[PDB]
Amino acid sequence: LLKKSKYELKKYNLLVENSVGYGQLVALLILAYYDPDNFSKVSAYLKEIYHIMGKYSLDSIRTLDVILNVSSQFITEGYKFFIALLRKSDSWPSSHVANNSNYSSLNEGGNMIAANIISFNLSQYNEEVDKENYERYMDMCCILLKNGFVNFYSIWDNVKPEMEFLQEYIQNLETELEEESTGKQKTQQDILLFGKIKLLERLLIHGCVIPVIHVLKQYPKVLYVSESLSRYLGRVFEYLLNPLYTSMTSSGESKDMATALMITRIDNGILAHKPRLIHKYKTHEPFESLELNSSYVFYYSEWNSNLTPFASVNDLFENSHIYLSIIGPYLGRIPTLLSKISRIGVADIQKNHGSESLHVTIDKWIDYVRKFIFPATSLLQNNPIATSEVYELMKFFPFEKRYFIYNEMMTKLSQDILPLKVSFNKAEREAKSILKALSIDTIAKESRRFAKLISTNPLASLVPAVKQIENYDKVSELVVYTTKYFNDFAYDVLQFVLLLRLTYNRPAVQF
Amino acid sequence: VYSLAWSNGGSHIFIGFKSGYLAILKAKHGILEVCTKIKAHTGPITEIKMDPWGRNFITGSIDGNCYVWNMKSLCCELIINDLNSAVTTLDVCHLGKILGICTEDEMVYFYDLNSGNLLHSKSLANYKTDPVLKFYPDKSWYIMSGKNDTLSNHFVKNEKNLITYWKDMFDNTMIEKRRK
Amino acid sequence: FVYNSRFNRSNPASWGNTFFELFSTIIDLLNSPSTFLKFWPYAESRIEWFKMNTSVEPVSLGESNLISYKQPLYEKLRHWNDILAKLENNDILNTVKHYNMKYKLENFLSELLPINEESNFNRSASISALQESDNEWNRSARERESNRSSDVIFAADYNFVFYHLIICPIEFAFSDLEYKNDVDRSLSPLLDAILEIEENFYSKIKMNNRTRYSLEEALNTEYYANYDVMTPKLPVYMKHSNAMKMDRNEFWANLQNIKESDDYTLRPTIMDISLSNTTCLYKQLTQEDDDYYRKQFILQLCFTTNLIRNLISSDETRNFYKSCYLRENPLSDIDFENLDEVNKKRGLNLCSYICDNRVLKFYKIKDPDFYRVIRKLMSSDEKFTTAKIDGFKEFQNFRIS
């Protein structure tokens, strides 16, 4: 009785201790999101909140939990009221506001009491109710990280799973890839749906690059967990690239703004012409869409305010050591980004033709196309069009430095990176299954099946083909018949493989 | 020159050759000059279509190959894995969702344009046609050629669109939930 | 001057007791709640000086060297809990500056102490008995003799469910059978009289914007439409008109100058339900125009029905409320001691009938935004009740870098 009625603070921590005082707090927040006037009377709603939780002795920790819990249902339309409400209350860090846009200040933070409620509430995903409200709650916590309300590392350290438990699940998965390159099932489906991994890709959808670059430079095999981390990081790099690509293809792409328009609908009353009628909806999915009559847009339109689209060629060569080195051989999962960088290269050789700075311009594009464009081409499945756009940059090269890149990618295939080695072992296993059932009656349609496998990656698939030509007969008449569907890339690799088999060390003359 | 097409505005012309080149050339008032020239396929470009919403355009060729190029950046966007035969005819709907491919295996397919998933597939093997799909321009019916020898049937419903079909399926389900 | 000259002491611990001593002199000598809110911005910016208890170097962020039974906070927390109880007793003479002083002072003690301090999270869970939305000055003589109209039998039936179901749910669960039939005979007419006049509020919104969706389809007969029944934020003519915005914003601007003046500083809350006045209680809950007074009664009834479910079924929650009633008086006149098993099966039928069958299935169709706010506050109340049983020991593993 001494430390209950003399030392214990008289506050009410649950929603049953004051059903009257918490019932008027929720109904005041339901009301504030139904006003047309919401930016002129921000400070008229705070002074009614402080009079509600002073009269009824409500907690100050549970109250900030109810404000973040009601305002996550209304985050699609009102997210400018919710931000302007929190900046005037006395829970905003006035002197600890420090940002997540710098590299040295992802530990200097603000409001560690709200960092204790957010990371506690992102960790609960076991009931059937909070599996449906997870995408709205996680999207609200990424607007509070942009502005500087919560530290980044205070959420990353204290949200489930653990970084010792994540690091053993990756290594269990890397072993499964090396076996094909020659309790957990319910836990792994809770790793990539909730927790750290889901938090890391909603931050990359909205705007946050600096806390995601700093994580993937530390644990570079956080990839091989989700295939969404390389899609959403190709949405940020394609925004920076796009003003440059429109100006390099100058006159054509500037009038391409006018070529995209549709056809009106013509009815036969007086034979009149009326346009088509659609209507907008704001959704949570990042990619823009259009259904039968409805078009969908991303709700948070200020997602690209911290970014800046870079200048011509000297800024592309600096910013690609950062972004394109994180997803090394994973640029081939975004084939439209691999086609855009290769047209910057052809348009830059031709305009800077001249006679003076041409041997310098080619040499700058040799080291670019061999560090992170040609490794990306090997992780491709069926793209004869994405591989022809790359080769039109390699037509400008001498053939000595084009044969250097071909041989090295058969040497740093095995000794180096794993995702390239699983891809080469899938093409060889598929080329060795076509060549067994190769008859003179089946080449009506197996000629088109075999010619897309060669056109995508020839270096994996042509070498089992010329090794089955010098073994058995009757297969020269079948492979030459298939050669009418090759492209210009698989014609230049086939000359390299034939020069490889003729100088190969073997007894030429018999015994 | 195998095929030609007008853009939806009426200011560019798309030309498909035998070597697989695709040329895009302006028609401003009287000038006729070449804007770009990309190499699309390894074979004759058979048919060229346009999206009715003006987003993308579709090309087909004599290998089993059919791309969907978008019209802003002029790069390939989606690839249909159709390794059966040579695509002969090709058309889209008027809402812009169904894509009808008809190859030289005498089989018709029906895809989506947003995704590349398959919806339906009919096989018409006993005929000796070069069968022609054609969609109506104002309602969502189609006229598929070839019933016996060289004929034309057309496939109808009681509702015109897909939008007035979903709107009728919704109101028939709602009566049952207003019944319980 | 006490903080800056702390190395030049003869003891670096002899400034932690001098800084709390002079700060408690200021609060007593300060004479008004108007001068308190003028000074208190000094004591909110310099809050990291209070946590560094007898240490010349500052604590990092989130760390505090303050425990509630040691020499700084041993005789000050006993003294600052008297002001906070002095200001709670006058429930008639409290202005709006007395309620702002009680907020800024109680918030100060919560940040000073850790989130896991035994005197910080209301460890012995006591439901309040002072939740009173009532004015005695609005009440004259409390008449109980002219029981004629429906205004005096509806408001005498709301005031029956409120005083012994909502403000005390633990005495409802562990009770007899003749006590929980007297609530059901008062709640079944009350819940049918409210949900009928909330079916007419949601049928004027449904039939307003369903006719003009049948009128888009006729006039420009190019495009069909099924949209949702939503809030059309401003119609078409209130969206972009600076003649209608500018005279509306200068109506709200002189409604605030009434509520910022030093004359009308004694006033009720905007969301307040009356209980004394029997005429205004029927006039608040029956008008089908506002519908923010019939949402409080649904929220008040879902908060204290969620507890009767959790306390009858589970037996660790039922064992936690054992200790809090035997510690405060062991010789207890109020009794809860055993199963009450027929009242277990009957009292669990007054739970799933109220908030699972009638309430939640009504709002699943009508108002989908308010259906998710009820559904989420139900489930998030159980993560906090369960963590209270342990002792809030899942908030102590928070780490700092």
From Swiss-Prot, chain A:
The keyword Nucleus applies. Component of the THO complex, which is composed of HPR1, MFT1, THO2 and THP2. Together with SUB2, TEX1 and YRA1, THO forms the transcription/export (TREX) complex. THO associates with DNA and RNA in vitro. It is found in: Nucleus. It comes from Saccharomyces cerevisiae (strain ATCC 204508 / S288c) (Baker's yeast). Present with 521 molecules/cell in log phase SD medium. The gene is THO2. The chain holds residues 161 to 719 of 1597 of the full protein. Keywords: Nucleus, Transcription, Transcription regulation. GO terms for cellular component: chromosome, telomeric region; nucleoplasmic THO complex; nucleus; THO complex; THO complex part of transcription export complex; transcription export complex. Component the THO subcomplex of the TREX complex, which operates in coupling transcription elongation to mRNA export. The THO complex is recruited to transcribed genes and moves along the gene with the elongating polymerase during transcription. THO is important for stabilizing nascent RNA in the RNA polymerase II elongation complex by preventing formation of DNA:RNA hybrids behind the elongating polymerase. One of its GO terms (biological process) is stress granule assembly. Belongs to the THOC2 family. GO terms for molecular function: mRNA binding; nucleic acid binding. This is THO complex subunit 2.
Swiss-Prot record, chain B:
One of its GO terms (biological process) is mRNA export from nucleus. Keywords: Nucleus, Repeat, Transcription, Transcription regulation, WD repeat. It comes from the Eukaryota. Coiled coil: none annotated. It is found in: Nucleus. Signal peptide: none annotated. GO terms for cellular component: THO complex; THO complex part of transcription export complex; transcription export complex. Component of the TREX complex, which operates in coupling transcription elongation to mRNA export. Belongs to the THOC3 family. Component of the transcription/export (TREX) complex and the THO complex. This is Protein TEX1. It comes from Saccharomyces cerevisiae (strain ATCC 204508 / S288c) (Baker's yeast).
Curated annotation (Swiss-Prot), chain C:
GO terms for molecular function: molecular adaptor activity; nucleic acid binding. It is found in: Nucleus. The modification Phosphoserine is found at residue 133. Disulfide bonds: none annotated. Its main location: nucleus. It comes from the Eukaryota. HPR1 is not required for sporulation, and is not essential for DNA repair. It is probably not a DNA topoisomerase. Component the THO subcomplex of the TREX complex, which operates in coupling transcription elongation to mRNA export. The THO complex is recruited to transcribed genes and moves along the gene with the elongating polymerase during transcription. THO is important for stabilizing nascent RNA in the RNA polymerase II elongation complex by preventing formation of DNA:RNA hybrids behind the elongating polymerase. Component of the THO complex, which is composed of HPR1, MFT1, THO2 and THP2. Together with SUB2, TEX1 and YRA1, THO forms the transcription/export (TREX) complex. THO associates with DNA and RNA in vitro. This is THO complex subunit HPR1. The chain holds residues 102 to 502 of 752 of the full protein.
